[PDB]
Design a protein around this ligand. Structure first.
Ligand SMILES: Nc1ncnc2c1ncn2[C@@H]1O[C@H](COP(=O)(O)OP(=O)(O)OP(=O)(O)O)[C@@H](O)[C@H]1O
Ligand SMILES: Nc1ncnc2c1ncn2[C@@H]1O[C@H](COP(=O)(O)OP(=O)(O)O)[C@@H](O)[C@H]1O
Ligand SMILES: Nc1ncnc2c1ncn2[C@@H]1O[C@H](COP(=O)(O)OP(=O)(O)O)[C@@H](O)[C@H]1O
Ligand SMILES: [Mg+2]
Ligand SMILES: [Mg+2]
Lengths: 187, 467, 501, 62, 48, 469
């Protein structure tokens, strides 16, 4: 079939297939940013009580749902790509997992703009100056151009130290795990 | 074109090409290994992914390695320089003697000869062995089947057939060891080096060994008979000469196929065998035929599981066999070598329309006399020789003489008996037996014939030992 | 103690590292479905957060199916799986001899830790076709029937097949004990470093076994791997390869080893569980399509290296259990078409009193004449022919009389030989004593002696030979043939002794 | 080496323990019960003879 | 003697790790963060 | 925590959690149930879901019911306060006598003793049964199995072992009926009350009981074995005692697992059994071994479907036993009760070093003669007995005498045969079989040895039979 441009990250399942299709189609025509904007919009537009209620009942003829989606997309004035994707989901019957699609697409667009996820789980509350130095040093792990998306977390369940996730890379320097390690190597 | 691995489930890899897929049966090289790992496509699963069966151990493969599409199915060297060498399924030598320097290459997946090519005249392959060539004649381009177990001279018979065909018909041979125990593989290599069919010094070898060991993954034991078929197809086509092809064993070909089919998830058939058993055997037993350029005989060892001759594997093999050679142990105790049984060995071409009226009458008479002697054996054992008249004792004497005369001294077996190899031509065998049946030699001691070639040598031996 | 605890604490590795990681999506039945681990090699050792291990066996496109090395009670959906990057490997060396290790080479004997230096993979390839050299030396098992009628050379796979409770482990342990005489002596070309892999057995059985070995002081050269019934499926599927690698160390180090798998039909069951839970397609009897590749790639490591690769060796005696003599089942035929022989055991023979219950009719060895000493060869050729002749007409035994004196002679010889082959338990005999007994048996020096007494004679004869004519036995042993002088001396000893009893 | 506070933590818990080793601190009567049970079992495995002398034999001749 | 030693060993352990968990509540947070961040600094420095 | 039921298929409930998931093997209490319903987690289906097998009927469960995570696996009372008290799979009295007032609760899912703890000693046990004590002596503190199909005598034989060994045994005892008739439940209860081993007045009971009889759901038959095993494990370890542990059947455990395996989404193995048969049996049958802390003599009645000893269940269980006494129906239909098969039966302590030359050689002579008789039967089928040899008729007569002599009138079979129970000290069994093999009784009739205890009773019966002649 026609060559398609692969995403940067691979997501799997139904949402994986639909998100990959949309991403490759958008890369052609270069409409990625506005496509993501419209995806976020349809997010809410599909959460209104009437729309979210008529798109779960399975006794609404499929064509009825398709036409209602078409009308709503005309009112919201979406790009041809996003309207076609909403249609596609509508007639394939897989619109019940539309939120899975857009979410996946976000994860595919984020990595396109190079914002690696991160995470710092701390022994307890943490200062900001400490957070400043943490960010400044973690930026040392990225590649040339990437950005950091750091989601701090407090955790008294661990004893001390901290856990740092960067993409997949995972460095555990919590006093807890040190205690288990010493007890193990000691037993 | 470079795809990427995306799954490694056991010995089944799954690659994801993008630009353009490789057609089924193409060989892909996995980049980043030190041992050459070769996958062979087997399906297309949509989404520009292909499910490949791996031809070697798939431990250490990483989702995302690069797999480079070769372009054509598994390719092997097929020159005359593949003679006296050992090469595994993908054509890589494993004799630790260097590269197989050849100018030709052949794909192991080539379709059978078209209908116009097929030769319409059923000939007879003169093996030079009295018993085989008389009672169970081997046919050119026929799928002979060699029954019998170990300890009864099955390797010696193989080497003798190789030597005799190389001398008489001036045609080379091959040996596709499907599922070949490594110990027995080494032993066969050194047996051939001894007997001289393989020669390491001068490049005058008559065998092109191919070995798919018993530990190599299942995907590479199903395709180790196609490698032999291709090495032999080169000789038949590009050199127009007769060829042998020993497939030891032909029950491990079906076993390897069944394992591969199970791995690809296909529903098992009648007795757990693959759903494509008949066609898998057909697309390999159908290149073993005599075209107009040359011919590929084939002597395939057969294992009959649980003595089930109805079992789907020996029931699908027998639909192709054009002969049989039931090596037996009970005939080895008497010392009659080769141990070939005369009363079990069948042959589809043992018909007077093909061999000739003289050959057929002689062979049928030998069979009848041997059956009658086997019957009288019971009466003699139970009651005693007294119980028999001379009208039966004459048949008994003739039968003992014939049972003796069927034994032959092989050339390769010189190490055992010291006697000289006798390549008795077909006419001499026919004359000898037609005469021993006509009573012309009812007086010579039986040991006159034991381990001789023609009948004239038997006369000379009788004269020698009678003084 | 305390002072020791100080360095116990100090002697640690506190350092951390930047390691890859994936999080468990699912768990249950002992099969984690980790998500992530994008750079995890197939068949690799990952570690869960709790502390378990796992072997990332099934790299699917979106997740990696890992098999836990223990109860997954400690694992939960969400845990962290950190890869180690190293294929499964195990310790090796001569430090293991006398220890008891589990499937991963961890001393389960107490008795201190293993002091091994060099490790070794478990998924290596067998030596090719050139490294091997024909099987020539014998492996004296110390059992008359095995050692004379169905010989076992060094470098040969010899299935030990038979029904339940027929004495298969007993044959293996007699083989292990017999090697004491060599392993105490001097020559290093006759020392066998037995190994014993216990799969699916209960820890009580392995404990009793190591007790037997220690009593006979046969542990100083034996390793005893053990993946017992309670150890999760992967540790039973993986023990045979740990044993085979511990033996491959010796083999490629110019030493002679011997590895006994017990059973190999409880490893295939564990692999079947692993596969069926990973959801791989099933096959006949529900076994996957690899239950031949599984065994074949294991029993094809038992080689006999040539003299350029060291001259080492690795025998293999896979014990298989057949359900009521159903040799046609899947696993029995899978493992009968890989090995170089079979020592069939039967219960009809075990309860007739023929113990060890070896069934010489079905038992074969495909090396044959080779793998015997010239003395034992001379004796056993005639013994084998006589026993075959007796078997082919034993159907008449219940009549005996009313028959030709020739068949009466055949029965009167076969009965004596059958009674001579009977052996005790954990009483292996050097080859020279076997040769002496079977010489006294096959040359007619018992045909006039009533069968019921033959066993007595046997024992007495040994006591009358070992304590009296050790010089003759040494003469037979040092040069493994019967020179006419030795033949005549044996004849005189047999005759005069029989006269004196 | 003292940089890791874990080492010093363990070290001085250990020390305080050794100083307390004037007795086995916090043994707990369950400790004594376990001792009791296993010491008996050990003794029976070793027999009932007084574990203080050379039990005399006065060996018997045919 | 051997049983004495092993049983007292395990008891000493029990007690020691119990005191470890009891005591680690002590105030070392900022110090611990300082050392750990320096350690990440070293890990990154060796990273490239 | 607190989750919700999302699916209820058969006897498998999938529960969705929003808080932290409960680990595998935990116990979950379904709220709003008149009778306590306890689910056990057995998977983590992903998406913050768990799948659980229910220990009681799932009638009335409603999608959305709130479910409380207990925190730890099924915990049951243990101690000497569970003696003479019947218990459910979840340790709650079913004898209508009020709660089990204990101080220690134990979790049924424990670990096996490690190799360093195994005890390597073994010494014969005297059950007072001729065939068992002769050809298959029972090791003290060693796993024992009673194979055999239906209706051969497994339950009667365990009743005999309870009657003999239990009372004559100092330490406590436990009987964990797994998936067997509820009638036998109270039959055993009343028999034990009569014997006095269970007292409903004083705290002098000696036998604890556990019952998962076959009317319970499959989820509660795969675990009652672990409940009984936990009680006995406590009596071994904590009480420092020696214990008897009777289980009957222990094939309903693997069958009960097989019943729910398919719903848990597992491919079915060889004969419909769950793929995880061997290891699920190993993780249970290896918490029963004797260790260095205490001794457990475990007697397990193992069903055998359709009298097929090759079936995966018994075929696997054969590796987890010391002494295996294979009851046979071919021998039960000759009136030789107990139906034991003298040739299939086996024991680990049948080595002359552990029973001595006299006993070992008597047993091996018995086995040899029985096998020779089996060989002759093929001929007698064609010839007829007259045309036999003259030395053979002797062996057939001796084999018949021995075969009849191995029968015995049990103390609990007084209602079947109307006989009086007999016990036979080991030495007497050896004496009798020595005499029979030597020919000292070759003159007596065969029917003299049918259903008699020591051989002297055989001679007395021969007399009394010849008088009325
Ligand atoms: N040579 C012998 N003489 C007498 N008895 C023997 C002999 N060999 C084995 N036995 C008996 O056979 C019984 C079973 O032995 P063994 O455990 O070796 O067989 P097995 O097949 O390994 O058993 P399982 O299959 O249950 O593990 C033992 O109790 C032993 O007494
Ligand atoms: N023509 C022959 N003359 C004498 N002996 C033979 C002859 N052919 C075979 N034999 C005997 O049969 C045996 C065959 O052994 P081999 O060929 O190595 O394996 P297999 O027994 O499987 O054929 C040889 O050892 C040899 O003694
Ligand atoms: N010692 C015995 N004497 C007489 N009959 C017996 C004896 N043992 C068992 N039976 C017979 O077996 C039946 C009980 O079988 P039972 O043991 O309950 O079957 P299962 O072994 O399947 O539980 C009784 O009806 C009885 O006839
Ligand atoms: Mg065993
Ligand atoms: Mg019952």
């Amino acid at each position: 079939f026609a060559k398609l441009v692969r995403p940067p990250v691979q997501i799997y399942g139904i949402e994986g297939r639909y998100a990959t299709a949309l991403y490759s189609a958008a890369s052609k025509q270069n409409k990625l940013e506005q496509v993501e904007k419209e995806l976020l919009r349809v997010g809410q537009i599909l959460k209104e009580p009437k729309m979210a209620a008529s798109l779960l009942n399975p006794y609404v003829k499929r064509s009825v749902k398709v036409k209602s989606l078409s009308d709503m997309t005309a009112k919201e004035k979406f790009s041809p790509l996003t309207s076609n994707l909403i249609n596609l989901l509508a007639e394939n019957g897989r619109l019940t997992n539309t939120p899975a699609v857009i979410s996946a697409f976000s994860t595919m667009m984020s990595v396109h703009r190079g914002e690696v996820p991160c995470t710092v789980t701390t022994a307890s509350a943490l200062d900001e100056a400490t957070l400043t130095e943490l960010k400044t040093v973690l930026k040392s792990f990225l590649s040339k151009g990437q950005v950091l998306k750091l989601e701090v977390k407090i955790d008294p369940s661990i004893m001390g130290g901290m856990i740092v996730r960067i993409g997949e890379k995972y460095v555990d320097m919590s006093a807890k795990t040190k205690i288990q390690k010493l007890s193990r190597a000691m037993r | 074109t470079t795809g990427r691995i995306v799954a490694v489930i056991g010995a089944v890899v799954d690659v994801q090409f993008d630009e353009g897929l490789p057609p089924i049966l193409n060989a892909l090289e996995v980049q980043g290994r030190e041992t050459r790992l070769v996958l062979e496509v087997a399906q297309h699963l949509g989404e520009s992914t292909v499910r490949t069966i791996a031809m070697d151990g798939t431990e250490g493969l990483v989702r995302g390695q690069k797999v480079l599409d070769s372009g054509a199915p598994i390719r092997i060297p097929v020159g005359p320089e593949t003679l006296g060498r050992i090469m595994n399924v993908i054509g890589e030598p494993i004799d630790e003697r260097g590269p197989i320097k050849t100018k030709q290459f052949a794909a192991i997946h080539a379709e059978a000869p078209e209908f116009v090519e097929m030769s319409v005249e059923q000939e007879i392959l003169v093996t030079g062995i009295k018993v085989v060539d008389l009672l169970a004649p081997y046919a050119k381009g026929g799928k002979i089947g060699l029954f019998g177990g170990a300890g009864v001279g099955k390797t010696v018979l193989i080497m003798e057939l190789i030597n005799n065909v190389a001398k008489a018909h001036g045609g080379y041979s091959v040996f596709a060891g499907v599922g070949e125990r490594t110990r027995e593989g080494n032993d066969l290599y050194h047996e051939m080096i001894e007997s001289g069919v393989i020669n390491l010094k001068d490049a005058t070898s008559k065998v092109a060994l191919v070995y798919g060991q018993m530990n190599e993954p299942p995907g590479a034991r199903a395709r180790v008979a196609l490698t032999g078929l291709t090495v032999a197809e080169y000789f038949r086509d590009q050199e127009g000469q007769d060829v042998l092809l020993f497939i030891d064993n032909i029950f491990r070909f079906t076993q390897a196929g069944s394992e591969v089919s199970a791995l690809l998830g296909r529903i098992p058939s009648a007795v757990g065998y693959q759903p494509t058993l008949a066609t898998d055997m057909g697309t390999m037993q159908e290149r073993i035929t005599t075209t107009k350029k040359g011919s590929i005989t084939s002597v395939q060892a057969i294992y009959v599981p649980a003595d089930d001759l109805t079992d789907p594997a020996p029931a699908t093999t027998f639909a192709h066999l054009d002969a049989t050679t039931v090596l037996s142990r009970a005939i080895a105790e008497l010392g009659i070598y080769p141990a070939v049984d005369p009363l079990d060995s069948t042959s589809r071409i043992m018909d007077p329309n093909i061999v000739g009226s003289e050959h057929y009458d002689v062979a049928r008479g030998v069979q009848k006399i041997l059956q009658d002697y086997k019957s009288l054996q019971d009466i003699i054992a139970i009651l005693g020789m007294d119980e028999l008249s001379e009208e039966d004792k004459l048949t008994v004497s003739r039968a003992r003489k014939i049972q003796r005369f069927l034994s032959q001294p092989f050339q390769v077996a010189e190490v055992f008996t010291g006697h000289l190899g006798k390549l008795v031509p077909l006419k001499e065998t026919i004359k000898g037996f037609q005469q021993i049946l006509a009573g012309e030699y009812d007086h010579l001691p039986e040991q006159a014939f034991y381990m001789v070639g023609p009948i004239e040598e038997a006369v000379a031996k009788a004269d020698k030992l009678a003084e | 103690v305390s002072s020791i605890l100080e360095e116990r604490i100090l002697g640690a590795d506190t350092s951390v590292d930047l390691e890859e990681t994936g999080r468990v999506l699912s768990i249950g039945d002992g099969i984690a479905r980790v998500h992530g681990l994008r750079n995890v090699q197939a068949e690799e050792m990952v570690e869960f957060s709790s502390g378990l291990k796992g072997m990332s066996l099934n790299l699917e496109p979106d997740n990696v199916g890992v098999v836990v090395f223990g109860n997954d009670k400690l694992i939960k959906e969400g845990d962290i799986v950190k890869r180690t990057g190293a294929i499964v490997d195990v310790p090796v060396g001569e430090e293991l001899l006398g220890r008891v290790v589990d499937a991963l080479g961890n001393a389960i004997d107490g008795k201190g830790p293993i002091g091994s230096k060099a490790r070794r993979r478990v998924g290596l390839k067998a030596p090719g076709i050139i490294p091997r050299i024909s099987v020539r030396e014998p492996m004296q098992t110390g059992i008359k029937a095995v050692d004379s009628l169905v010989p076992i050379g060094r470098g040969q796979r010899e299935l030990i097949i038979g029904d339940r409770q027929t004495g298969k482990t007993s044959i293996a342990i007699d083989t292990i004990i017999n090697q004491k005489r060599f392993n105490d002596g001097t020559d290093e070309k006759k020392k066998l470093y037995c190994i014993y892999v216990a799969i699916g057995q209960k820890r009580s059985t392995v404990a009793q076994l190591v007790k037997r070995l220690t009593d006979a002081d046969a542990m100083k050269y034996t390793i005893v791997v053990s993946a017992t019934a309670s150890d999760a499926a992967p540790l039973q599927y993986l023990a045979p390869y740990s044993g085979c690698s511990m033996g491959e160390y010796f083999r490629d180090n110019g030493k002679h080893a011997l590895i006994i798998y017990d059973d190999l039909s409880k490893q295939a069951v564990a692999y079947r569980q692993m596969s069926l839970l990973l959801r791989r397609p099933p096959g006949r009897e529900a076994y996957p399509g690899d239950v031949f590749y599984l065994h074949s790639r294991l029993l094809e490591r038992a080689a006999k290296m040539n003299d350029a690769f060291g001259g080492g060796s690795l025998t293999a005696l896979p014990v298989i259990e057949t359900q009521a003599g159903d040799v046609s089942a899947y696993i029995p035929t899978n493992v009968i078409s890989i090995t170089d022989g079979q020592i069939f055991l039967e219960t009809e023979l075990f309860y007739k009193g023929i113990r060890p219950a070896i069934n010489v009719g079905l038992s074969v060895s495909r090396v044959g004449s080779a793998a015997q000493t010239r003395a034992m060869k001379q004796v056993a050729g005639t013994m084998k022919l006589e026993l075959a002749q007796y078997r082919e007409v034993a159907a008449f035994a219940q009549f005996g009389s009313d028959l030709d004196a020739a068949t009466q002679q055949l029965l009167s010889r076969g009965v004596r030989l059958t009674e001579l082959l009977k052996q005790g338990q954990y009483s292996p005999m050097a080859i020279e004593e076997q040769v002496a007994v079977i010489y006294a048996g096959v040359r007619g020096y018992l045909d006039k002696l009533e069968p019921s007494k033959i066993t007595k004679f046997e024992n007495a004869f040994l006591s009358h030979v070992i304590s009296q004519h050790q010089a003759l036995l040494g003469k037979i042993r040092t040069d493994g043939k019967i020179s006419e002088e030795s033949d005549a001396k044996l004849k005189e000893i047999v005759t005069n002794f029989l006269a004196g009893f | 080496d003292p940089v890791q506070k874990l080492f010093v933590d363990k070290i001085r818990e250990y020390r305080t323990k050794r100083q307390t080793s004037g007795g086995p601190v916090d043994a707990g009567p369950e400790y004594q019960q376990d001792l009791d049970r296993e010491l008996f079992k050990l003794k029976q495995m070793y027999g009932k003879a007084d574990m203080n002398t050379f039990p005399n034999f006065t060996f018997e001749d045919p | 003697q051997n049983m004495m030693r092993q049983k007292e060993q395990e008891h000493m352990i029990n007690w020691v790790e119990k005191r470890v968990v009891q005591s680690i509540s002590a105030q070392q947070e900022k110090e611990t963060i300082a050392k750990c961040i320096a350690d990440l600094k070293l890990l990154s420095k060796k990273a490239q």
